[PDB]
A and B are shown apart, each in its own frame.
With several copies, the nearest count.
Chain A
Amino acid sequence: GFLGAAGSTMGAASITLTVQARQLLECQQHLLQDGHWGIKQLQTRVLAIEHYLKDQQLLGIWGCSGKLICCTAVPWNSSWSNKSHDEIWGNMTWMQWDREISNYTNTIYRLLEDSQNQQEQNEKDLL
């Protein structure tokens, strides 16, 4: 429970996030013994680790690893959202925006992957 600035404007939410995102970082005698609780706790922890590493892998594929805000080279296409700038970042919440562009996430991911392939080719061409 650390959903700071949830439901506020996307711009205000991002301005808050620039500071907030950097804030990251005898039961066993009874629990985890003579019952199914050990397996459940291990499953929860392993699932959390799996999701964390999947997110970090997905960031790495786009070349955005090690960043919280990473600008990309993919040009935004208007077909994904008829609203323009300052209407998304003003008078709109993060949840509303995510529900608005839920459908095009796969397309955006494919474009990001192609972009990163081209960036790697440019870097190899730099040598």
Chain B
Amino acid sequence: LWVTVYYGVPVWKDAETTLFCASDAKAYEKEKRNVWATHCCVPTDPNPQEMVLENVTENFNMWKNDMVEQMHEDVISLWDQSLKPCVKLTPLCVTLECRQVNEEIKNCSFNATTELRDKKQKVYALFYRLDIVPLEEERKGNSSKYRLINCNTSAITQACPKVTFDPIPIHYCAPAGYAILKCNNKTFNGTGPCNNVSTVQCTHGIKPVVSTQLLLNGSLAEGEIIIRSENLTNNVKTIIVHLNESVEIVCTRPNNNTVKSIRIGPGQWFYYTGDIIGNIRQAYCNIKKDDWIRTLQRVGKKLAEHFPRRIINFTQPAGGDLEITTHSFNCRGEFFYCNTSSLFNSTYNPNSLDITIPCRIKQIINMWQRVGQAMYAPPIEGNITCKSNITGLLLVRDGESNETEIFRPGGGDMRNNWRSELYKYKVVEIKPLGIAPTRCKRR
């Protein structure tokens, strides 16, 4: 009958705000530290509070979610800050001279600088052929002249050896006055209402992993395999697949790769691959065959359901640069690049052993397609081996065709990797002030 002002009303509006990162109290040991531990210095509450919203339906949209942009910018800024005070390898861009070691490796020699500006030191180093450009025609009579790649593009920064970029589970928490809504409904695709929602002050542990074709870590789907895509009919939109069971992959670099260090300037140290012990062998990845085949069969079934009356065809990635055609990832600082052609060689029907994937290695990197910047990854002694759980795939439908849909790996844009983890969440602002009628006058 009469207006009445209520304060503290439970109503929220869609909003955008600068979330702050929070991690476990023992994020990392302070001796060597980590970029994710030096950042995210906010202890998290164990077993975060979860207030399930009874009989509440809310609209979600994993795409057009600002949390993805915030995480992307946070990762970029953190990497830039970490690489800012490290050594500049601008002095090393000189005319390199290289010969055979005894195809990928080359025994390059050059005149590097010293702490004294009037002196130079002869340096012998094993550089990968990918990181070295054929300055001459590469006739290879006896030797030939080269340069470091990207030297004409931009200066090269050494990654600090004392700091490690290994991912750790980090939690995003909303500031005061805002809340994060988590859609707990199984088999819910983005861009639609969700019936099982809950309120949390912080997200679950998210591992900021870098990869191009396979999501090497993260959370498995609750129920069955789930397909997600902005349109699913426009062939430009990338398709994301969440697996409800992991697929083991073990990757290694079977070389000794002895490490040596020299001083190129006052307080400036530079690390290189020196020499090797034992045979030259290519890096490779072993992935379980039966599990991979079953997972591809199930994914083919799901795509056939979403694309009826077609043949789901999995094809190797189209030809192109190594940065866009290979499965990239980062094991202990070494940057791998795997062909993975053999993994996508199967056709689904609409009517003990391991797969060994050859992989190359690069030291000079251009991350996130930031033309005008680069970094140098120093080597590590001993043979490296790492293990990971392939939890998802990134597929690009080619989109004319003889009853066939062509799915290829791709989606090199890094926002997709974090959207695959942040699809559940939405940030909202609380508007506590509210008005309703009642049966009483103010007098």
A contact residues vs B (CB 8 Å cutoff) = 1-8, 10, 12-17, 19-31, 34-37, 40-41, 43-45, 47-48, 51-52, 55, 58-59, 62, 64, 67-76, 81, 85, 88-89, 93-95, 97-98, 101, 105, 108, 111-112, 115, 119, 124-127
**Residue of A1, A37, A76, A119 most packed against chain B (CB within 10 A):** A1
B438:A85 contact, CB within 8 angstroms: yes
The residues of B with any CB-CB pair to A shorter than 8 Å are 1-12, 17-18, 20, 38-39, 41-42, 49, 51, 53-57, 77, 81, 174-177, 179-180, 199-201, 430-443
The 8 Å CB contact of A13, one of B4, B9, B435, is: B9
Contact yes or no, A70 B11, CB < 8 A: no
- Checking A23, A101, A127 against B441 with a beta-carbon cut-off of 8 angstroms, the contacting residue is A127
Contacts of B433 in A (CB 8 A): 55, 58-59
Assembly CA distance A95 to B10 (angstroms):
7
* Complex interface: chain B residues within 8 A of A24 (CB): 8
Q: Is the CB of B54 within 8 A of A119?
A: no
A-B contacts, CB under 8 A, total: 193
Q: Is the CB of A6 within 8 A of B8?
A: no
Query: How many Å from the CB of B118 to the closest CB on chain A?
Result: 35
Instruction: Tell me the minimal C-beta distance from B124 to chain A in angstroms.
Output: 38
Q: List, in ascending order, chain A residues with CB within 8 A of B438's CB.
A: 71, 85
Bound Cα distance from A95 to B176, whole angstroms: 21
B41–A112 CB distance below 8 A: no
5 contacts between A and B (CB under 8 A): A3-B199, A35-B77, A55-B7, A55-B432, A73-B442
Task: Identify whether the interface residues of B are mostly helix, strand, loop, or mixed.
Answer: loop
Inter-chain contact A2/B430, CB cutoff 8 Å? yes
Alpha-carbon gap, A51 to B5, bound state (A): 17
> Given A21, A43, A85, which contacts B8 in the complex, CB threshold below 8 Å?
A21
Residues of A within 8 A of B54 (CB): 5-8
Q: Give 15 A-B pairs besides A1-B174, A6-B199, A71-B443 with Cβ atoms closer than 8 angstroms.
A: A1-B179, A2-B8, A4-B199, A13-B10, A17-B10, A19-B7, A30-B38, A44-B20, A76-B1, A85-B437, A85-B439, A94-B9, A98-B431, A115-B442, A124-B440
Question: A88 CB to closest chain B CB, in angstroms?
Answer: 6
Closest 9 CB pairs of A and B: A19-B8, A7-B56, A7-B54, A21-B8, A28-B41, A6-B10, A76-B437, A73-B442, A74-B3
- Which residue of the partner chain, among B4, B10, B17, B439, contacts A69 with CB atoms under 8 Å? B4
